[PDB]
Amino acid sequence: AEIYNKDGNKVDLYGKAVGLHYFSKGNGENSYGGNGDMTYARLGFKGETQINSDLTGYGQWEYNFQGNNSEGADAQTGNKTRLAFAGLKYADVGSFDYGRNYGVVYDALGYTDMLPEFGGDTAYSDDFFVGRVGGVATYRNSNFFGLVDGLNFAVQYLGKNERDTARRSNGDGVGGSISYEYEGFGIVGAYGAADRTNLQEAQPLGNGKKAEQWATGLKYDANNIYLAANYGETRNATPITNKFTNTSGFANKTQDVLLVAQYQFDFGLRPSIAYTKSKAKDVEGIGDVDLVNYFEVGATYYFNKNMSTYVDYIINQIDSDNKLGVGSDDTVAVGIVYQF
Amino acid sequence: AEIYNKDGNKVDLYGKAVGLHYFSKGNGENSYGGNGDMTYARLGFKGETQINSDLTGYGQWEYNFQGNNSEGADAQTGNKTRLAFAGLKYADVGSFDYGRNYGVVYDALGYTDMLPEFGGDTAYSDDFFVGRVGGVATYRNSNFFGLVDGLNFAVQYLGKNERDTARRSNGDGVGGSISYEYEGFGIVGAYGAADRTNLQEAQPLGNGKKAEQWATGLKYDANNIYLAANYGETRNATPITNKFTNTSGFANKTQDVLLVAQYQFDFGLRPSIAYTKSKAKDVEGIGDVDLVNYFEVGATYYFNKNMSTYVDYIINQIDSDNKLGVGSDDTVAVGIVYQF
Amino acid sequence: AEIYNKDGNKVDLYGKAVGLHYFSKGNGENSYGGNGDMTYARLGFKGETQINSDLTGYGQWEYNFQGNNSEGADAQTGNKTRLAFAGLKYADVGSFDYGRNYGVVYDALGYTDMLPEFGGDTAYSDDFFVGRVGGVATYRNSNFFGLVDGLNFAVQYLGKNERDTARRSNGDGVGGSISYEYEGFGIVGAYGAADRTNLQEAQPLGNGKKAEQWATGLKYDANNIYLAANYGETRNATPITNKFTNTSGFANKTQDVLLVAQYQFDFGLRPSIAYTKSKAKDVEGIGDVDLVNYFEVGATYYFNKNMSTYVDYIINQIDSDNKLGVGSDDTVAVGIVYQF
């Protein structure tokens, strides 16, 4: 949906309206993702202008609006800016941009973020390199310098964000990524490291002086089938919670496995199967604990370019004896999607 | 104001800027609607796409922005999402949609919601069936199945919304509506019932286990004159306040009368007269009390399709001895409207 | 970027994405403007319709979105409506509008508000006549009545805004402005006076019963050079802070000097030099104190109509012995700008 393309600047305003309802037992106190109305809406703009033949300029913004709130004092719950960045792009040297963007481990973790509603549990927001972080300076090179094509690599720097809370805070850091596609396949390497703030060190769960994250994945996005497998590891950069002690902090070391498989049909139904197991290792008091564990059967039906429905059915395999109390119940998600 | 109609999807972005100032005595502590600056602004999008000849898809979102706030810590006061929904529509069977939409009693109560600023006092927001409620699943049939035209009927289901406050909360419920227009006239039937939450039961004002609402109205929207009369009743679903006790809750039974009359001229001035009397019956301690009571003379001048002014003058007839302290003073509202 | 111009109504949606990073020593506790990520984004619409040949109608809205926040509970920090107003315009008598707009001293103080990021320190928001105030009723005349052109004058009325805080509050007031441009030059007179609220009187810093502001400036915006000089004075209308006592209030009398100089080149780099000195006189306990004091060297490079970069380097000349603890450190600002 492009609205203004006149001089050298093309501007498209994009948004979506999603009507969701979650299905769980109880009130969602022991469940994955909860229970009840969780509808929302999105709105943002993407910009692109040509300064000359080679150097271009771009910027993007995106917002999250929530419809499951009331019209009272609880109106802005989960209303937030997902993207806010701007930068330039030259021909062969690459592109620099700055603002609120993703991390460089999301190049690996984004391969299994293809489910209807859930999935991409390892891609936590404000988790130093795996989600949308405010204050990132990213340099991306698409095809090496024109030397070979289908060989992506990027380099990121992270700015110091000392907030009031310890879950969203981070410090200075450096990351990088290497990707390669050929014959419809795909392989991604990614690694990032950042130094912690003193508010994050004083938390009871987790102790350390540097937060390291890495991941590597594969891909078979060709011939209407999708297959991917991400394996990653994380030191001092995983947000955990202890509901038995009411103490929150980070995990010392965490190992993550994600799988996904999809098939697209000609009329437009897309079945999906997925498996995710994230295990936190050597946390204080507990030992080895499993954070995320589910099988998944779901399906997405695409009516056209703009209208869609999806059903997403979580089979939680946490064995209801978790020492962190992560919540172990099955969840069904049924949604209706319009976008432009 | 439609901006993008290219492939099968027409998207129009709509908004308005309203500059309001209320006129009352004192600070609005004993007044209807208050005193001072109450300007605001709206913004949203409406979407419509054709999947094929018969099945279409649609979605809508709307936001309220407030200009009477400052640029300090009180910025988002009364900033909220009014509409957020999405659904499909087939040819003869009807249309299903889900999200944040109106209720099915608003088909009756919307006939007298035609004033410049005020009016539609019975149409409270988050009052189970008479305003915009988040989590509604509505099925609407326009003309019966093509069998007769000018015969509307709808069926709604309400989802359980157990919030932190008791005024916005609700439970599961079922409602329905029947409408009929012929020869420019109109007649609407509407009824809805929902079961209360346990936070609503523990409130001191009002006690009960089910919230029932119904209304029925008439219409003469033809030949540039407007005439309508809504009569409705409500059991356990009316938000009241006791300023003498500082206790808030619901009313046991409430009976509501609304009248309106308008005339449009060729140059564009629209005078208005209205009468609203809402009476709460058998509340604890008080007995029978009158919540809403006013005469009204107002006028709206339309410059063109987009620019307008209106004056709206409340003659409050609450006799300054109300046992709930509802506020009994006259209020003038003067506004300037731009929209697109 | 105009999107809808069809019937008589032209509507343009405008926004920008700015990626900023501030450079200071420490955490910005003794600095001008702070330290760290300060990126943001803007979005709004401007409207214009012709009712007939002479009378037109217009309205505008603008919002501030902040990207330096997280996606947690601190999401809406500094998110606010900058503009919200609407009104009409006739041919020769002028134009009336109402809502949230600027003040009439901003006609004088806006001449030196031409820096890349900083500058316009005297133009405080919600400071009765020098910033964007909610509840203003402004009448502006462009060229006198068609009698002479290049002679602007305006008259403003201020409504009573009794808020919860004393910094954003104000009372009823009257202001006016006179401007004159000829041969590329410019000269502006401006004055405004308003009566204080009782919450503003009870504050320890500053005491008085009326807030008076005035300013007068010059201009040489011709032949690609810019030169301007604003001198203004202010009685009982300047927000000050005492970090040594943790007491906040207003200043009794304040005198302000602003200078600016710019040069535009053909390829698009714009160097800038500026000098601002604001001095508060006869405050309680301190005496005469200097609030704002800096030299400035900065530059803005315009790539095209839509893409730009700027560097802005504060040379703070507060002598680190200020009795109010205003903060005395140098600050560099580096930004990347996209707009449409």
Side-chain angles (χ1 to χ4, degrees):
Chain A
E2 201 152 64
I3 47 171
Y4 178 77
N5 175 36
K6 185 179 185 294
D7 47 356
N9 190 17
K10 72 189 208 298
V11 172
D12 56 335
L13 185 142
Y14 68 101
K16 74 181 183 179
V18 187
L20 271 163
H21 181 201
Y22 277 31
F23 296 93
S24 296
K25 292 174 330 256
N27 73 97
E29 77 280 65
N30 199 4
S31 174
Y32 184 93
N35 189 15
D37 208 49
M38 279 194 99
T39 183
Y40 62 95
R42 304 270 165 88
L43 183 85
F45 62 92
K46 186 178 168 298
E48 181 72 29
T49 175
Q50 282 88 24
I51 294 140
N52 47 17
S53 65
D54 285 354
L55 181 85
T56 118
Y58 61 98
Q60 202 180 342
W61 169 78
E62 199 191 28
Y63 204 84
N64 201 348
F65 293 98
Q66 283 276 350
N68 66 342
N69 309 325
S70 77
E71 278 182 73
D74 60 316
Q76 286 89 345
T77 306
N79 280 8
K80 53 184 139 17
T81 69
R82 297 164 50 99
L83 319 164
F85 59 94
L88 340 147
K89 176 191 262 203
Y90 208 49
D92 308 0
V93 293
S95 10
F96 173 79
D97 84 313
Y98 181 80
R100 189 167 217 276
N101 212 7
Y102 289 85
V104 280
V105 188
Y106 190 71
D107 312 309
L109 285 184
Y111 272 10
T112 43
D113 208 318
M114 301 277 293
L115 278 114
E117 180 68 31
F118 302 112
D121 305 278
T122 318
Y124 294 102
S125 190
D126 297 315
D127 191 42
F128 288 71
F129 272 122
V130 302
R132 306 170 298 259
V133 181
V136 296
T138 308
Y139 154 72
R140 300 194 160 273
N141 209 317
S142 75
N143 294 330
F144 198 73
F145 290 103
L147 293 212
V148 296
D149 358 343
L151 183 67
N152 311 113
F153 83 100
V155 160
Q156 208 174 57
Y157 177 79
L158 189 60
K160 183 176 179 179
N161 285 259
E162 186 161 346
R163 305 203 204 272
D164 52 12
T165 182
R167 191 248 170 270
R168 310 289 166 174
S169 297
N170 66 90
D172 299 286
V174 157
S177 79
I178 277 176
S179 183
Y180 176 78
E181 293 86 2
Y182 195 67
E183 294 292 328
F185 286 89
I187 174 174
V188 175
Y191 169 71
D195 164 282
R196 309 179 81 204
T197 54
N198 293 114
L199 202 57
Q200 291 170 324
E201 300 180 30
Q203 293 299 315
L205 282 166
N207 193 349
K209 314 105 80 138
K210 179 183 31 213
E212 281 186 351
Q213 286 164 321
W214 64 265
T216 175
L218 277 84
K219 204 186 192 72
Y220 193 30
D221 197 9
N223 290 45
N224 292 288
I225 58 185
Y226 195 88
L227 284 151
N230 292 118
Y231 184 73
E233 282 182 11
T234 291
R235 309 271 194 84
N236 307 328
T238 303
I240 71 178
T241 338
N242 200 344
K243 295 195 194 169
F244 275 21
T245 311
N246 202 356
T247 267
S248 103
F250 283 91
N252 283 108
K253 40 171 67 177
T254 314
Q255 300 157 340
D256 312 310
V257 179
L258 294 102
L259 298 171
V260 71
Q262 281 159 111
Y263 194 25
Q264 185 67 272
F265 275 77
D266 279 342
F267 53 92
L269 150 75
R270 195 168 201 169
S272 302
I273 42 168
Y275 181 37
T276 304
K277 187 167 173 179
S278 176
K279 168 171 64 178
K281 296 294 288 184
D282 310 343
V283 288
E284 306 97 308
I286 295 98
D288 40 302
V289 68
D290 300 311
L291 309 181
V292 180
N293 200 328
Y294 59 91
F295 282 162
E296 177 61 44
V297 182
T300 301
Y301 186 67
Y302 291 98
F303 291 101
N304 66 335
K305 278 29 179 214
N306 310 118
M307 213 69 204
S308 177
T309 52
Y310 56 86
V311 58
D312 208 21
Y313 168 58
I314 291 274
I315 315 183
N316 205 332
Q317 272 197 348
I318 289 149
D319 60 271
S320 58
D321 308 308
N322 196 286
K323 299 296 183 181
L324 285 180
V326 291
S328 139
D329 263 332
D330 296 330
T331 309
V332 189
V334 166
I336 172 69
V337 152
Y338 172 70
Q339 67 195 79
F340 64 99
Chain B
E2 201 152 64
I3 47 171
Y4 178 77
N5 175 36
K6 185 178 185 294
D7 47 356
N9 190 17
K10 72 189 208 298
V11 172
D12 56 335
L13 185 142
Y14 68 101
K16 74 181 183 179
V18 187
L20 271 163
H21 181 201
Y22 277 31
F23 296 93
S24 296
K25 292 174 330 256
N27 73 97
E29 77 280 65
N30 199 4
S31 174
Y32 184 93
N35 189 15
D37 208 49
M38 279 194 99
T39 183
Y40 62 95
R42 304 270 165 88
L43 183 85
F45 62 92
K46 186 178 168 298
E48 181 72 29
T49 175
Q50 282 88 24
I51 294 140
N52 47 17
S53 65
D54 285 354
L55 181 85
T56 118
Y58 61 98
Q60 202 180 342
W61 169 78
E62 199 191 28
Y63 204 84
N64 201 348
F65 293 98
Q66 283 276 350
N68 66 342
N69 309 325
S70 77
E71 278 182 73
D74 60 315
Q76 286 89 345
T77 306
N79 280 8
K80 53 184 139 17
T81 69
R82 297 164 50 99
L83 319 164
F85 59 94
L88 340 147
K89 176 191 262 203
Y90 208 49
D92 308 0
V93 293
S95 10
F96 173 79
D97 84 313
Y98 181 80
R100 189 167 217 276
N101 212 7
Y102 289 85
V104 280
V105 188
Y106 190 71
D107 312 309
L109 285 184
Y111 272 10
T112 43
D113 208 318
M114 301 277 293
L115 278 114
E117 180 68 31
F118 302 112
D121 305 278
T122 318
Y124 294 102
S125 190
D126 297 315
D127 191 42
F128 288 71
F129 272 122
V130 302
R132 306 170 298 259
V133 181
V136 296
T138 308
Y139 154 72
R140 300 194 160 273
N141 209 317
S142 75
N143 294 330
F144 198 73
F145 290 103
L147 293 212
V148 296
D149 358 343
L151 183 67
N152 311 113
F153 84 100
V155 160
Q156 208 174 58
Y157 177 79
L158 189 60
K160 183 176 179 179
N161 285 259
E162 186 161 346
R163 305 203 204 272
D164 52 12
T165 182
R167 191 248 170 270
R168 310 289 166 174
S169 297
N170 66 90
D172 299 286
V174 157
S177 79
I178 277 176
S179 183
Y180 176 78
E181 293 86 2
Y182 195 67
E183 294 292 328
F185 286 89
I187 174 174
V188 175
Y191 169 71
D195 164 282
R196 309 178 81 204
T197 54
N198 293 114
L199 202 57
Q200 291 170 324
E201 300 180 30
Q203 293 299 315
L205 282 166
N207 193 349
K209 314 105 80 138
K210 179 183 31 213
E212 281 186 351
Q213 286 164 320
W214 64 265
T216 175
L218 277 84
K219 204 186 192 72
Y220 193 30
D221 197 9
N223 290 45
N224 292 288
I225 58 185
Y226 195 88
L227 284 151
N230 292 118
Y231 184 73
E233 282 182 11
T234 291
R235 309 271 194 84
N236 307 328
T238 303
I240 70 178
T241 338
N242 200 344
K243 295 195 194 169
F244 275 21
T245 311
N246 202 356
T247 267
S248 103
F250 283 91
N252 283 109
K253 40 171 67 177
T254 314
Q255 300 157 340
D256 312 310
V257 179
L258 294 102
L259 298 171
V260 71
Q262 281 159 111
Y263 194 25
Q264 185 67 272
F265 275 77
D266 279 343
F267 53 92
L269 150 75
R270 195 168 201 169
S272 302
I273 42 168
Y275 181 37
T276 304
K277 187 167 173 179
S278 176
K279 168 171 64 178
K281 296 294 288 184
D282 310 343
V283 288
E284 306 97 308
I286 295 97
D288 40 301
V289 68
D290 300 311
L291 309 181
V292 180
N293 200 328
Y294 59 91
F295 282 162
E296 177 61 44
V297 182
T300 301
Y301 186 67
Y302 291 98
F303 291 101
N304 66 335
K305 278 29 179 214
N306 310 118
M307 213 70 204
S308 177
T309 52
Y310 56 86
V311 59
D312 208 21
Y313 168 59
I314 291 274
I315 315 183
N316 205 332
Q317 272 197 348
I318 289 149
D319 60 271
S320 58
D321 308 308
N322 196 286
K323 299 296 183 181
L324 285 180
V326 291
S328 139
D329 263 332
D330 296 330
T331 309
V332 189
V334 166
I336 172 69
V337 152
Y338 172 70
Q339 67 195 79
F340 64 99
Chain C
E2 201 152 64
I3 47 171
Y4 178 77
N5 175 36
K6 185 179 185 294
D7 47 356
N9 190 17
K10 71 189 208 298
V11 172
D12 56 335
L13 185 142
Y14 68 101
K16 74 181 183 179
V18 187
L20 271 163
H21 181 201
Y22 277 31
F23 296 93
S24 296
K25 292 174 330 256
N27 72 97
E29 77 280 65
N30 199 4
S31 174
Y32 184 93
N35 189 15
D37 208 49
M38 279 194 99
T39 183
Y40 62 94
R42 304 270 165 88
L43 183 85
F45 62 92
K46 186 178 168 298
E48 181 72 29
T49 175
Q50 282 88 24
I51 294 140
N52 47 17
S53 65
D54 285 354
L55 181 85
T56 118
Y58 61 97
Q60 202 180 342
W61 169 78
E62 199 191 28
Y63 204 84
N64 201 348
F65 293 98
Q66 283 276 350
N68 66 342
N69 309 325
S70 77
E71 278 182 73
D74 60 315
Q76 286 89 345
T77 306
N79 280 8
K80 53 184 139 17
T81 69
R82 297 164 50 99
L83 319 164
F85 59 94
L88 340 147
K89 176 191 262 203
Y90 208 49
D92 308 0
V93 293
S95 10
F96 173 79
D97 84 313
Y98 181 80
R100 189 167 217 276
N101 212 7
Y102 289 85
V104 280
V105 188
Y106 190 71
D107 312 309
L109 285 184
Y111 272 10
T112 43
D113 208 318
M114 301 277 293
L115 278 114
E117 180 68 31
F118 302 112
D121 305 278
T122 318
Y124 294 102
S125 190
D126 298 315
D127 191 42
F128 288 71
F129 272 122
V130 302
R132 306 170 298 259
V133 181
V136 296
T138 308
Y139 154 72
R140 300 194 160 273
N141 209 317
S142 75
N143 294 330
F144 198 73
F145 290 103
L147 293 212
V148 296
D149 358 343
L151 183 67
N152 311 113
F153 83 100
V155 160
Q156 208 174 58
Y157 177 79
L158 189 60
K160 183 176 179 179
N161 285 259
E162 186 161 346
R163 305 203 204 272
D164 52 12
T165 182
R167 191 248 170 270
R168 310 289 166 174
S169 297
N170 66 90
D172 299 286
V174 157
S177 79
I178 277 176
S179 183
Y180 176 78
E181 293 86 2
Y182 195 67
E183 294 292 328
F185 286 89
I187 174 174
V188 175
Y191 169 71
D195 164 282
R196 309 178 81 204
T197 54
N198 293 114
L199 202 57
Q200 291 170 324
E201 300 180 30
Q203 293 299 315
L205 282 166
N207 193 349
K209 314 105 80 138
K210 179 183 31 213
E212 281 186 351
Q213 286 164 321
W214 64 266
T216 175
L218 277 84
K219 204 186 192 72
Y220 193 30
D221 197 9
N223 290 45
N224 292 288
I225 58 185
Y226 195 88
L227 284 151
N230 292 118
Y231 184 73
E233 282 182 11
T234 291
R235 309 271 194 84
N236 306 328
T238 303
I240 71 178
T241 338
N242 200 344
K243 295 195 194 169
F244 275 21
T245 311
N246 202 356
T247 267
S248 103
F250 283 91
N252 283 108
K253 40 171 67 177
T254 314
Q255 300 157 340
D256 312 310
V257 179
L258 294 102
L259 298 171
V260 71
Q262 281 159 111
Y263 194 25
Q264 185 67 272
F265 275 77
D266 279 342
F267 53 92
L269 150 75
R270 195 168 201 169
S272 302
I273 42 168
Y275 181 37
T276 304
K277 187 167 173 179
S278 175
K279 168 171 64 178
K281 296 294 288 184
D282 310 343
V283 288
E284 306 97 308
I286 295 97
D288 40 301
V289 68
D290 300 311
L291 309 180
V292 180
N293 200 328
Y294 59 91
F295 282 162
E296 177 61 44
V297 182
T300 301
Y301 186 67
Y302 291 98
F303 291 101
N304 66 334
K305 278 29 179 214
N306 310 118
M307 213 70 204
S308 177
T309 52
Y310 56 86
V311 59
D312 208 21
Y313 168 59
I314 291 274
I315 315 183
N316 205 332
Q317 272 197 348
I318 289 149
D319 60 271
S320 58
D321 308 308
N322 196 286
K323 299 296 183 181
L324 285 181
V326 291
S328 139
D329 263 332
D330 296 330
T331 309
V332 189
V334 166
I336 172 69
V337 152
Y338 172 70
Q339 67 195 79
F340 64 99

